[PDB]
Design a protein around this ligand. Structure first.
Ligand SMILES: CCCCCCCCCCCCCCCCCC(=O)OC[C@H](COP(=O)([O-])OCC(O)COP(=O)([O-])OC[C@@H](COC(=O)CCCCCCCCCCCCCCCCC)OC(=O)CCCCCCCCCCCCCCCCC)OC(=O)CCCCCCCCCCCCCCCCC
Ligand SMILES: COC1=C(OC)C(=O)C(C/C=C(\C)CC/C=C(\C)CC/C=C(\C)CC/C=C(/C)CC/C=C(/C)CC/C=C(\C)CC/C=C(\C)CC/C=C(\C)CC/C=C(/C)CCC=C(C)C)=C(C)C1=O
Ligand SMILES: CCCCCCCCCCCCCCCCCC(=O)OC[C@H](COP(=O)([O-])OCC[N+](C)(C)C)OC(=O)CCCCCCCCCCCCCCCCC
Ligand SMILES: CCCCCCCCCCCCCCCCCC(=O)OC[C@H](COP(=O)([O-])OCC[N+](C)(C)C)OC(=O)CCCCCCCCCCCCCCCCC
Ligand SMILES: CCCCCCCCCCCCCCCCCC(=O)OC[C@H](COP(=O)([O-])OCC[N+](C)(C)C)OC(=O)CCCCCCCCCCCCCCCCC
Ligand SMILES: CCCCCCCCCCCCCCCCCC(=O)OC[C@H](COP(=O)([O-])OCC[N+](C)(C)C)OC(=O)CCCCCCCCCCCCCCCCC
Ligand SMILES: CCCCCCCCCCCCCCCCCC(=O)OC[C@H](COP(=O)(O)OCCN)OC(=O)CCCCCCCCCCCCCCCCC
Ligand SMILES: CCCCCCCCCCCCCCCCCC(=O)OC[C@H](COP(=O)(O)OCCN)OC(=O)CCCCCCCCCCCCCCCCC
Ligand SMILES: CCCCCCCCCCCCCCCCCC(=O)OC[C@H](COP(=O)(O)OCCN)OC(=O)CCCCCCCCCCCCCCCCC
Ligand SMILES: CCCCCCCCCCCCCCCCCC(=O)OC[C@H](COP(=O)(O)OCCN)OC(=O)CCCCCCCCCCCCCCCCC
Ligand code: SF4
Lengths: 70, 49, 318, 83, 72, 157, 172, 98, 115
């Protein structure tokens, strides 16, 4: 009947939810619990490079708050 | 409703072929899990429903 | 980790393509009062793997009249451009984040048309030549109309990125403001993907097989994979652009699930349309896209030029 | 005229795509000339601060420019906030 | 006797409602939508496919198959 | 036996499974037998359910179902489209005409069986054989190419 | 990652060399497509993506029409590629050798003239606004709508008159 | 930038050399013209991007527009030539010497 | 770098697929196997012969229209301008001129195919 299509539909559904979910999780894992920063303009790229220099570990995603200020 | 009745027919089709092994046997040999009245069985072992 | 991201994008897209072939067989069968494949595997789920293995263990054809270099180059080009078009889509986060995403999409689609053209010319056969020329006419018509459609839609959106489209459809689908050009975009995607009634290049009844009539086994498999990956691709692009899935900052899994459901619905609509309609004649396709779609597309482009100006709803740059 | 209306109805019956296209063209032409929000688009684009506001040297002769951003003087965007 | 399959009798004239109906038919693809609906109905029907070789198509005693020589 | 012999046998089983689960016939027919062939394509029997799908070009075909009377004027064309099929190819003669000439055996313009022109793998008898009989022949061909031992013969070489 | 632009420029030179050597127009259009893609990559590396993607799309449409035309009327029974003639293939390899010889001569004799291998990859991006919005290349082409309306109208009249011109030429 | 600009200038020189050295195919001559056009576009675009001349960035698009009009008219003339002779041969286009 | 990497991965994957497709199965090719396909008979003439094009005028028009598309494409950045009246007027003029050209060609039967 018409519900025999549903196994192939479910396989397609799993194979379509895997790329987006995995991409979001990989971005979060590689940026340390935060989303991957988007530098659409030179100002945002400069912010990312300033964060990378500020962190002292050459990783922009290691943010420094008020613990660096006396 | 009728959806639960369809699910009842489905679960009896699943648990109507003996066991899990019998269900897998009929599903991978005949590609069909319908339950029918056993009309007979011949001398060679073919079952007729 | 980026290579693992490449793998977890590429491999599930390929498996979804193969099960799209299976689900096309099942849906077409059930619309044709039959069942479709349910023997090879539990419910037919091993049928695409059987077909892939058979095609990759059948010998390829190298005809005497055929230009070998372009004959080899065309199918691998087609598959690479299909996966490249897949790469920048956000669900809701793209693997490759671009600024001019739809321009990348348009360039890669036209290069896929070139893959079809070079296959048809390299396979030195008259039916292949027919398929190449029909591809030329088809891509002329849908290229001009689809470019104007996408221009109007992104004029409503404000930028060429696609995360911007997610932010645009945060509150409402673009189907409600832009449903006529949504219909014209859907027809344009059908013609772009060469699906019935606008296939006209793998003409089963008019030609024999058209542009890939001399292709066998492996390269034919590459062409089929490229085409069906493009089907899922264009339906995914349609649901990203027009039917905006629910996006929440705290969880993107809801966006991925809604995107998957809408993309599956649009792909099933493609199979439904192939079942329902007879094939166009390829001059009638050009006459349609140049006499009905194009004047209305120009009018709606002017309307979407005017609309943010007199409503003060000019979209943000970022 | 009656013949004009009959021709328009015939066009709407047989070739509605061209009628819709011409109507949308005309509406896009005439709509910004009658809408009251048309000036607001240019004003919003002017108010969008893509560049840094370079301060001017105060010689004590211009009283209109504000000394501080949180001053009553200057181009406030209350119209945009309440838009 | 005979009948016409495509000849139209008289004319329906021109009306605003009829013109709008034809315009909606052309623009909104109404016959295409109802063709889609017909295919959808067939999708939700039950297929006519038997499970060969476990199910065989019906025959009659008159059926002419493989030859044989009989006995008393 | 040797461990590698078992691996070769399993690889043979895998290849034969793929080739018998994916059998694409050429869209080729000649007569009333081809009418019964599209009645096999019809929703009752569903060759597509069995995995059998027509392809128009002989390059994408795996099997050739000779369904009809092979005439003298047709024989070069039939040989041509058979030769243009790629190597793992099979031939199913269908009906008395393609088998041994049939009702036109003593005709001046009829090839007395398509086995004079192409090597036939499976003969399906009838005039016409029913779509049941043609489907039976297709399944018998699937069993026949399941019986193939190509890698095992290559290993034993 | 320093000689990437130089590699692209060399590939563009090779594609233009093949186009100059004039194979069958199918292969000429193929070489022009590859050259357009390479030029798009060069504009991408040097700056804004919009100009490169624009010339890529324009040349994709153009060589599509060119492919249709050369299958229509500019074709022959045996199309001529770069390898079908010994003279054309010899000119191809001789042009490659001459390119290598010329870049070596400009590297050694002329020192820092047009080509410097030590200085290669150092003078690609001269000055960039490190902090700044509204810097991409498409904004100038957008400023054609406002700053250069004369440019807009001459381009539009060129296309309009071109439609009339092609209709009158192919009127027959 | 200077090595890239020299390579682009040599690419234009090769395309001009191809245009000036005819073979039998007028379509190939038009392709050489389009290659000259492409080299001009890339030179103008990299010059504008190097000098940050966003005011002069409409110039490459204008070049593309007028050059595509040129290519369109060339294709129309090639259509007329092929209708006259059956081929696009510049050796057939020779009867105006007398 | 990442985009270049994934493009190269796609190239490698497709080259690997076509390479295994050409070197995995058994080869048996002869003259009739590799002769071109003409539905069972020999081709009367080569397929490299001239093949008439009935939409050549539409193709030239497509070139001009594609350049009109290239002109219209900087609109999403053009709508951010201060002088929106000039941009709106210029865009209206461009689209109206394009539409008038299309209408003139439709009137002069340029969209219709020859013969
Ligand atoms: C990828 C696969 C490449 C190899 C394909 C293959 O099997 O070649 C058979 C080949 C053996 O030749 P064959 O099969 O005996 O001869 C029949 C071939 O069809 C004969 O080959 P053909 O008829 O396809 O003609 C080949 C021809 C045409 O093929 C190409 O040009 C292909 C490469 C495009 C790039 O190539 C050439 O003439 C040499 C081109 C060298 C590169 C181009 C340099 C100048 C232009 C620069 C820009 C290029 C864009 O190896
Ligand atoms: C009365 O007079 C007469 C006629 O007049 C009417 C005649 O006509 C006539 C001639 C008669 C005939 C020739 C009979 C022919 C019969 C018919 C015309 C009727 C049959 C009907 C049709 C053909 C219509 C069928 C319609 C359909 C919708 C069916 C679908 C068919 C398709 C072709 C589309 C589906 C595609 C396929 C089956 C192939 C798809 C699959 C692949 C190519 C696989 C690709 C996948 C991969 C390569 C993926 C690989 C990648 C991975 C990652 C996989 C991972 C793998 C692992 C191993 C892990 C005669 C003689 C005649 O007398
Ligand atoms: C992605 C979102 C969903 C998209 C739709 C998906 C579901 C539906 C899919 C249906 C199946 C399609 C299969 C392919 C069909 C191909 C045929 C086809 O579509 O032909 C196109 C047909 C062509 O019709 P035709 O060709 O029959 O007409 C004859 C025309 N001549 C004589 C010139 C040849 O229709 C169109 O071109 C219409 C396009 C859409 C128009 C929408 C207009 C909406 C209203 C606008 C505003 C009106 C008011 C204005 C203001 C007034 C103020 C007072
Ligand atoms: C989209 C529709 C997909 C198919 C839905 C089921 C098909 C069967 C419906 C019932 C039927 O047969 O109706 C026939 C009927 C037509 O019957 P008819 O042919 O007798 O016409 C009625 C009479 N006149 C001519 C006056 C109109 O369909 C309709 O009444 C509606 C058809 C037009 C509206 C739908 C198509 C255009 C939609 C555009 C916007 C996109 C919508 C959202 C899409 C979201 C997903 C992408
Ligand atoms: C990712 C999608 C695509 C996946 C592709 C499939 C992957 C898995 C493949 C498993 C099987 C691998 C071997 C396939 C061999 C197919 C051809 C064949 O059987 O040739 C027989 C021939 C037999 O050769 P032969 O020595 O008997 O003689 C051939 C010549 N004749 C018959 C004319 C005398 O070749 C082999 O046996 C080669 C075995 C290679 C094994 C590699 C492992
Ligand atoms: C795995 C399939 C690819 C393969 O074996 O390619 C090798 C290729 C395949 O060429 P081939 O076309 O002769 O392959 C043999 C036939 N099949 C495909 C059935 C396996 O070359 C050889 O096998 C022999 C070449 C010389 C080897 C010299 C020693 C190398 C160590
Ligand atoms: C079989 C042969 C096939 C040959 C054809 C290959 C086609 C590949 C797929 C289609 C490509 C279409 C053209 C794409 C051009 C780049 C598109 C683009 O917009 O790139 C810009 C992007 C980043 O720019 P932007 O979006 O502005 O972001 C800045 C802030 N994030 O990204 C960048 O700036 C990155 C710049 C490089 C991107 C392209 C990389 C191409 C790699 C080479 C492929 C061919 C290799 C040679 C052949 C190998 C052997 C066959
Ligand atoms: C694909 C794989 C297979 C399918 C997977 C999804 C299966 C979904 C099954 C359940 C669908 C339930 C729809 C409503 C059913 C209840 C009902 O009342 O139905 C009747 C109603 C029409 O009744 P009526 O009163 O005549 O309506 C007039 C006003 N419209 O009917 C309606 O109003 C219908 C409204 C929905 C129409 C589309 C339904 C199918 C959607 C998926 C199509 C996929 C095609 C491929
Ligand atoms: C430099 C200027 C002189 C170049 C002369 C090249 C040879 C020549 O005259 O070719 C004529 C040829 C005419 O066209 P065609 O129909 O092919 O000719 C058939 C022969 N009767 O012409 C053609 O086929 C057109 C050839 C265009 C080639 C453009 C690219 C040339 C690259 C090499 C340039 C010269 C390098 C010399 C190096 C010398 C050693 C350092
Ligand atoms: C300002 C100008 C630009 C505005 C934006 C819209 C752009 C439209 C571009 C194309 C317009 C072409 C119109 C003229 C034309 O070529 O019409 C041809 C058409 C008949 O030709 P065809 O479709 O081939 O018919 C087959 C043979 N009977 O003939 C017809 O279909 C006749 C159409 C008659 C009605 C025209 C529209 C009237 C609109 C009234 C709106 C009132 C509110
Ligand atoms: S065997 Fe009988 S049914 Fe079949 S083709 Fe011959 S005459 Fe027709």
């Amino acid at each position: 009947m018409w519900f025999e299509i549903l196994p192939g539909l479910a396989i397609m559904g799993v194979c379509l939810v895997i790329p987006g979910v995995s991409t979001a999780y990989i971005h979060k894992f590689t940026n340390g619990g935060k989303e991957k920063r988007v530098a659409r303009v030179q100002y945002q790229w400069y912010l990312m490079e300033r964060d990378r220099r500020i962190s002292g570990v050459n990783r922009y995603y290691v943010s420094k708050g008020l613990e660096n200020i006396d | 409703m009728e959806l639960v009745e369809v699910l009842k027919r489905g679960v009896q089709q699943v648990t109507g072929h003996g066991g899990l092994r019998g269900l897998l046997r009929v599903f991978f040999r005949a590609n069909d899990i319908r339950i029918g009245t056993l009309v007979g069985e011949d001398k060679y072992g073919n079952k007729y429903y | 980790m980026f290579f693992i991201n490449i793998l977890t994008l590429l491999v599930p897209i390929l498996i979804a393509m193969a099960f799209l072939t299976l689900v096309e067989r099942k849906i077409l069968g059930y619309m044709q009062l039959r069942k479709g494949p349910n023997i090879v595997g539990p419910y037919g789920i091993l049928q695409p793997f059987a077909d892939a293995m058979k095609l990759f263990m059948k010998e390829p054809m190298r005809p005497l009249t055929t230009s070998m270099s372009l004959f080899i180059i065309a199918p691998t080009l087609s598959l690479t451009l299909a996966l490249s078009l897949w790469v920048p889509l956000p669900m809701p986060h793209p693997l490759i984040n671009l600024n001019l995403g739809i321009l990348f999409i348009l360039a890669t689609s036209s290069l896929s048309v070139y893959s079809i053209l070079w296959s048809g010319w390299a396979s030195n056969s008259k039916y292949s030549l027919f398929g190449a020329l029909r591809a030329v006419a088809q891509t002329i018509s849908y290229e001009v109309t689809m470019a104007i459609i996408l221009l109007s839609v992104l004029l409503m959106n404000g930028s060429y990125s696609l995360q911007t489209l997610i932010t645009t459809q945060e509150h409402m689908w673009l189907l409600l403001p832009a449903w006529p050009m949504a219909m014209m975009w859907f027809i344009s995607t059908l013609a772009e993907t060469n699906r019935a009634p606008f296939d006209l290049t793998e003409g089963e009844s008019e030609l024999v097989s058209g542009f890939n009539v001399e292709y066998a086994a492996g390269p034919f498999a590459l062409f089929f994979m490229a085409e069906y990956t493009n089907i899922i691709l264009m339906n995914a692009l349609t649901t990203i652009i027009f039917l905006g899935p629910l996006y929440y900052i705290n969880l993107p899994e809801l966006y991925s699930t809604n995107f998957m459901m809408e993309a599956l619905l649009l792909s099933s609509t493609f199979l439904w349309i192939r079942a329902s309609y007879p094939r166009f004649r390829y001059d009638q396709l050009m006459h349609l896209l140049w006499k009905n779609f194009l004047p209305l597309t120009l009018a709606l482009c002017m309307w979407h030029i005017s609309l943010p100006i007199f409503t003060a709803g000019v979209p943000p740059y970022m | 005229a009656g013949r004009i209306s009959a021709f328009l109805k015939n066009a709407w019956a047989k070739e509605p795509v061209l009628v819709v296209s011409f109507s949308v063209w005309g509406l896009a032409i005439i709509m910004p000339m009658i809408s009251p929000y048309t000036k607001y688009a240019s004003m919003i684009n002017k108010a969008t601060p893509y560049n840094y506001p370079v301060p001017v040297r105060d010689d004590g002769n211009m009283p209109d420019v504000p000394s501080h951003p949180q001053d009553p003087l200057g181009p406030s965007l209350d119209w945009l906030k309440n838009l | 006797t005979y009948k016409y399959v495509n000849k139209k009798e008289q004319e329906s004239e021109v009306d605003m409602k009829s013109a709008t109906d034809n315009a909606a038919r052309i623009l909104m693809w109404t016959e295409l939508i109802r063709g889609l609906g017909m295919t959808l109905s067939y999708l939700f029907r039950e297929p006519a496919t038997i499970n060969y070789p476990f199910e065989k198509g019906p025959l009659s005693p008159r059926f002419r198959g493989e030859h044989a020589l009989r006995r008393y | 036996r040797s461990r590698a012999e078992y691996v070769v046998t399993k690889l043979d089983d895998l290849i034969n499974w793929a080739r018998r689960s994916s059998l694409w016939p050429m869209t080729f027919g000649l007569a009333c037998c081809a009418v019964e062939m599209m009645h096999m394509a019809a929703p009752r029997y569903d060759m597509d359910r069995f995995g059998v799908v027509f392809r128009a070009s002989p390059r994408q075909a795996d099997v050739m179902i000779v369904a009809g009377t092979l005439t003298n004027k047709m024989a070069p064309a039939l040989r041509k489209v058979y030769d243009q099929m790629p190597e793992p190819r099979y031939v199913v003669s269908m009906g008395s005409c393609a088998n041994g000439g049939g009702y036109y055996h003593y005709s001046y313009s009829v090839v007395r069986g398509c086995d004079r022109i192409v090597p036939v793998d499976i003969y399906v008898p009838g005039c016409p054989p029913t779509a049941e009989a043609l489907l039976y022949g297709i399944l018998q061909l699937q069993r026949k190419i399941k019986r193939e031992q190509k890698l095992k013969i290559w290993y034993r070489r | 990652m320093n000689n990437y632009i130089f590699v692209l420029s060399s590939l563009f030179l090779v594609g233009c060399l093949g186009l100059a050597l004039k194979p069958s127009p199918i292969y000429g259009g193929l070489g022009l497509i590859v050259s357009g893609f390479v030029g798009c990559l060069m504009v991408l590396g040097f700056g804004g993506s919009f100009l490169g993607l624009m010339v890529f799309l324009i040349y994709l449409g153009g060589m599509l029409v060119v492919f249709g035309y050369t299958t229509a009327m500019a074709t022959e029974e045996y199309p001529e590629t770069w390898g079908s003639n010994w003279l054309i293939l010899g000119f191809l390899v001789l042009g490659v050798i001459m390119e290598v010889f010329l870049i070596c001569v400009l590297n050694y004799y002329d020192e820092v003239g047009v080509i410097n291998l030590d200085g290669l990859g150092d003078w690609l991006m001269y000055e960039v606004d490190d902090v700044g919005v509204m810097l991409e290349g498409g904004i100038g082409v957008a400023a054609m709508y406002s700053c250069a309306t004369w440019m807009m109208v001459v381009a539009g009249w060129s296309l309009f008159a071109g439609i009339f011109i092609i209709i009158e030429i192919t009127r027959d | 930038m200077p090595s890239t600009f020299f390579n682009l200038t040599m690419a234009f020189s090769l395309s001009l050399l191809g245009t000036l050295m005819f073979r039998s195919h007028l379509m190939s001559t038009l392709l050489c013209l389009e290659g000259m056009v492409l080299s001009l576009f890339i030179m103008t675009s990299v010059t504008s991007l190097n000098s940050n001349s966003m005011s002069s960035m409409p110039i490459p698009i204008t070049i593309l527009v007028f050059a595509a009009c040129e290519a369109a008219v060339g294709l129309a003339l090639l259509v007329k030539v092929s209708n006259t002779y059956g081929t696009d041969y510049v050796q057939n286009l020779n009867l105006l010497q007398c | 770098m990442n985009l270049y990497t994934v493009i190269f991965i796609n190239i490698l994957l497709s080259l690997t697929l076509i390479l295994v497709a050409f070197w995995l199965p058994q080869m048996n090719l002869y003259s009739e196997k590799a002769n071109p396909y003409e539905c069972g008979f020999d081709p009367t003439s080569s397929a490299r012969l001239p093949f008439s094009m009935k939409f050549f005028l539409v193709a030239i028009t497509f070139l001009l229209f594609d350049l009109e598309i290239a002109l219209l494409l900087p609109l999403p950045w053009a709508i951010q301008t201060i002088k929106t009246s000039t941009m709106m007027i210029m865009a209206f003029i461009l689209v109206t001129i394009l539409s008038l050209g299309l209408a003139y060609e439709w009137t002069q039967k340029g969209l219709e195919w020859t013969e």
